[PDB]
Design a protein around this ligand. Structure first.
Ligand SMILES: [Fe+3]
Ligand SMILES: [Fe+3]
Ligand SMILES: [Fe+3]
Ligand SMILES: [Fe+3]
Ligand SMILES: [Fe+3]
Ligand SMILES: [Fe+3]
Lengths: 163, 164, 164, 164, 164, 169
């Protein structure tokens, strides 16, 4: 199917670009805002996006006989002004990933392609998982004004159905 | 120093783009040429370029007070026709990395910046290491015509006191 | 070489005097500002400066046939007024050590003395390491106003592949 | 008490300066007289004087509310001519430390200050201990003329219920 | 680079010839001067020179694409008359190796060849290490007149963080 | 005995020069012919010739009161053109070592010197041992045309553990 191939190539492109942006944001949070553990958190997000999230797509293309495309273009030239606004923009990016995955699932069920549906269930689940763990950190910036307290909470964060 | 900052930002950009290109080449070698172990080899190269080779630069920028820039642009739209030509183009890329690193070292010694010299010794050594391990695979395609023999040799490859 | 001998004797003198000053500052931070863990931190700095940082110089003088000189003179007559200003003056001292070491390295490379260059690489690296770990503590006094929170952070501080 | 504070500050100054002088003497004995184990012995003496012998004084000042002073001034510009004369001057320094400690103890008992008496018992005992272990080495230079024999005896030295 | 190739071939030749000469000297010291442990020491030196000190050069030539040459010519026709004069001539040979290595390092830094500089740091360090351990034995022949005492000292010799 | 001393000094000289030549050949086989395991094999040969094969002679001279001489002169200026011709020239060198050792044994038995006979039995045995293990590799270049197959065979020859024969060990 050509439209499933197109949709999965777009998701590949998206994952690569998000990973690079998160690497830059991790550097900015640790270096400029004096929060090294928030930086570790965003860096783990980046490595997640740059690893399995595209390994699985290229493995699937190897298995079923589809074609892979590589066309990357990113440029970070504007940065939020807090750690609050930083983690809020991270939240928005994850929320967009959810809706893109939903569109893919609908498409695959409209084509009678049940292997692609089985394949995309993984991403369906992982989207809500990642959004939940990002919102856990987003909500700490409302519960406290002291940066070292938030820091130790984040540190101890980083150290059945949605598994 | 501004010129050292420029040179290190360029090396960051280069490492990112090489890693992405090697990911595509690994997929092509496994899927199109029927050589899964050559693909594993090139994929390990890709992960190497996308991991520590840029972690170290961003860590150094955190330590000494320099500024990081992100501007990536890659597009793979032409592919070699063999596994031989594929690994030969990989060899050429590594050989270019060597010369870029040499230019950086010369620059850093011209500025009386000895922490940058100490820092770039790592890349100086790793360049020759990676070129050596890529040439080991390049030379197998001259020693045999049977693809399964080359395959098992590469497999048992993937499975020093100065250049360690 | 006589100028390398002079430079290394000056670095010996400097290390001794810095160690003594840091011992006094550790006592002042624990006793007068009610921060015992900041005192432990500065005391570890002092022992570092009074141990290996001069053992290595005297060992090198034994190995290559140079002469050692001892002329110490310190007097603490003024103290900062916070723990913030205290750790800030500590930061300035480390930043001066960096520049002295850089001058030594330049000198040694100008004399074709490659054993002294090899020797001073250690200090080149350790300078940035110590500056980094001191700045880690300097930046905590901007992130909080409660002394007990900063205290437990410093406590859990006190309890790399290139910069190791 | 002000006179006990003065006496303990003087003992602090004395310990620092003795430690530095012993570091220089250790270097001289190993490098110039060709006796590396005598150098190890004097170096252990130096580290002893620069460690606990002043840590205890500054800890006591923290506990009872006294004030610490730092005023160091040393200059080594004359050296004995043997290893015999070297260890003999070391013996004289230890013998002076004994008498200074005795004066402190008398003073503290004259002021009805029993915590300072309890504190100085440690130094009273350690003085005779250190003098005994230095005289053990001083007497070897009378029992033999061969330097390698004395050397191996000192080496196996470096490798009580009341005076423990 | 051709001049670096020439210099490294000369160092190869030198190492081979020194190893052979030290083998003969070890035999002479054990057989003719009745000092078997001095012979064991010089034989360890010989095996060191004939092993890694040329294995590394040939490995480097394999890695970077240089050419190896073999042209050996030694002839022992005169021998010192003591064990003292023997170990003194050994000291002189090591001191010449140091200066040859220094010339190589200068040359390699003049050509903008940073892999050769990185490579020769090993020899720069090992030169001073070997000179130090030879001088340790040279100085024993001044500290004693009894051959059996020197023998047991050398035996227990044969049985660092910067110079390691 | 002076003639036994002469013969053993010549064998010392020969062993040193063979070791150096084998070091150069190992470098050439690994670097120029793209056969790293053949290079490892020839390098083990070189270390063998430069170690015990002259340690034993100098030890014997220490024990019985003979004199040692050192006069070395080698120059490699011509190289074979294959790995086949390389291992064939190695075979010829070992075959010459055998005949030199045989001459020594005859000489020592002609002088009523039975300690030298007892001493040279070791070299008598080791000559045939080394010739056998070199011929094992020489014959692989007739059994195959693929360089990677020969390489794998040589690898399992060199890496697997050493088993001693009950007569020739
Ligand atoms: Fe995920
Ligand atoms: Fe690498
Ligand atoms: Fe340090
Ligand atoms: Fe004591
Ligand atoms: Fe060595
Ligand atoms: Fe053999």
């Amino acid at each position: 199917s050509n439209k499933i191939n197109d949709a999965l190539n777009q998701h590949y492109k998206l994952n690569v670009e998000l990973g690079l942006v998160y690497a830059h944001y991790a550097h900015v949070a640790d270096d400029e805002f004096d929060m090294p553990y928030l930086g570790k958190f965003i860096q783990h997000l980046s490595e997640d996006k740059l690893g399995v999230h595209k390994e699985y797509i290229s493995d699937y293309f190897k298995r079923n006989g589809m074609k892979l495309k590589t066309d990357v273009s990113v440029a970070v030239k504007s940065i939020p002004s807090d750690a609050k606004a930083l983690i809020q923009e991270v939240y928005a990016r994850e929320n967009e990933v959810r809706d893109h995955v939903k569109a893919i699932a609908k498409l695959a069920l409209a084509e009678d392609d049940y292997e692609s549906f089985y394949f995309i269930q993984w991403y369906v689940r992982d989207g809500l998982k990642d959004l939940t763990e990002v919102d856990d950190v987003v909500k700490l910036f409302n519960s406290s004004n002291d940066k070292l307290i938030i820091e130790e909470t984040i540190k101890e964060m980083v150290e059945e159905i949605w598994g």
